[PDB]
């Protein structure tokens, strides 16, 4: 008799039984079939020690809350360990040979530790995967509304390239936007409408050329460096008009419907819509060999060496 | 709507102590200014004490100071009035009143919407 | 991205 | 069905209808008034198989609206797709033109991918550099033997 | 548009069994009521059977029951007509028709939009 | 090494997914800013503005 | 009339994620055979 485990959990999978003890941090592996004690040469104390130990452990720990399910069962475990197992059920839920045992139990302790960490990690990461899928499906609704609000930006984000979009009923027709170099685009000084006093342009006028040597083409500055071919964005004049417009990598600032100033994005206070998540990698670690006593030390502990 | 009940009233003695409990049934107790109004025998009704809807101010009548203390327990939907050192000129019939967050006239009586049956308290030697 | 873009009206050619 | 009642949101359960009991009409034009059309196609549906026919207008995401008030001024070059059952109905020039499945429409995703895989079961076999029999045998002379 | 083809027609003896296939080309098969219409020689066209666009409804003619079974396979974009125990009056000129979800008049031939060339089947002793 | 490699790979995949999700939600935030400047500013600044 | 937020039916826009910490674990010393058992397995001890 080596160990008495008052809490051994048996789990069946892979066509095998796993007997895990949290107290001694050990996981034994057996086959599903029961190992016959008649196969053991001179093994009469296995049953008597097992029955005595199981009864004493049951009377001390499980007497009032659990019941025994059948007689003790015997299983042969990898490494050569004979497990006598008395299953318990909650009260609310009711030829001879010699076994060779390895001197090293750390395989089973590694099994226990790896199984524990693996089960925790798998459970947590699966919960995260389910939550992520649910969040994506849940955000699809917000995307459906935002598509109606701004087809151009939503299409560009969900397609992966700058496109113009229009909702053709319940689907979204798209078309690739032709790029234009920023140096080929300039903004006009005055945002007022020459023909009609009392009305102005909502967004500043621009002059751009598709190529360096191409002819000049008039237009109106759209959103996010878009060049609109039609200058129809018109609003009634309003006093105290102060606007910033995206232009290239920065902003053009217009005051009183006239070009006023220029800014970079570093000159504007920045607030974040992003939620921070700082995940760092677990670092490499090296395990050096380590022994309490070398086998030379164990050999030398004897007082007299017969050979020498 | 909110229906109010009173408990704990009874005949007392000078220099004693008591606690009146005002229990509210319905919804929106935490959105109610809750107070007390006492009518003397052969005399009109007068303001006593009122705790505000957020429970952060406690308005008192001009004729009483320190004797009565009103407090609120939203978990029980109740208002407790701890009354100390009662007097013959103080004894009356007490009613619990409640009003939404729609007036600062806690002293005035007709502002309150929810009026209860009342309770009887009398002091004597 | 500092590049500008000219976007023609999206026909129902690709939806 | 939902409606903002100030700062809270009144809701009411929608009654289901089988798609075989719903058909769409050919013409999206308004019979009475030329120059104006229906924004979304008209439908005829029955609450049950043997029930009487009921007119309506196709709403969003297979919704059956009882009132045909979705009206827009007529516009040339009118091409629309409308969700219907598990697919789309394609209307051209305010008239029924075609029907499509979801597989016939190019699909773009709003979902961010996350591929999480489970750590796999591993078995630790017994392993010793020297067995205790080997350690016993390393001695040159065994006194007992 | 959707273009339909028929296959499987041929010479079959009385009491035999056959499976006709109507294969569709184009898009939107799964949104299409698909049926068959048979026209007798020297006689007009009559309704046979039709599977609904959802595939959950199977309407039949007034003259045939338990003989013709229409069943649709969307994976192959086809409709199969399983024909059993053909009589002398069963044989006719069979066409495959399709129509969108825009009419309940599956029996009427004029309602369907997509019309195919048809196939030849003959019952003779 | 086995546990470390698995954990590092999975958590790196999560970090990449989180970055992509934030960049992706910036578009919804841009639209909601025009919808309700007061609430969007209060939620992205950290005080009622 | 007047209501508290407890008097209104509450629906959630939040996606649940229940992450729990891996618990502390204690590894007791464990040996199949002690070095005294290994010494004692010999039939005759020359020193003794
Ligand atoms: Na997903
Ligand atoms: Na990020």
PDB file of C-alpha atoms in Angstrom, chain B residues 27-28 31-32 114, chain G residues 1-4 7:
ATOM      1  CA  UNK B  27     -43.854  52.062  -8.208  1.00  0.00           C
ATOM      2  CA  UNK B  28     -41.609  55.099  -8.107  1.00  0.00           C
ATOM      3  CA  UNK B  31     -38.821  59.355  -7.186  1.00  0.00           C
ATOM      4  CA  UNK B  32     -41.039  60.775  -4.413  1.00  0.00           C
ATOM      5  CA  UNK B 114     -50.596  60.927  -2.531  1.00  0.00           C
TER       6      UNK B 114
ATOM      7  CA  UNK G   1     -46.779  59.266 -12.632  1.00  0.00           C
ATOM      8  CA  UNK G   2     -43.188  58.434 -11.615  1.00  0.00           C
ATOM      9  CA  UNK G   3     -41.072  55.288 -11.979  1.00  0.00           C
ATOM     10  CA  UNK G   4     -37.722  54.008 -10.806  1.00  0.00           C
ATOM     11  CA  UNK G   7     -39.864  49.352 -12.418  1.00  0.00           C
TER      12      UNK G   7
END
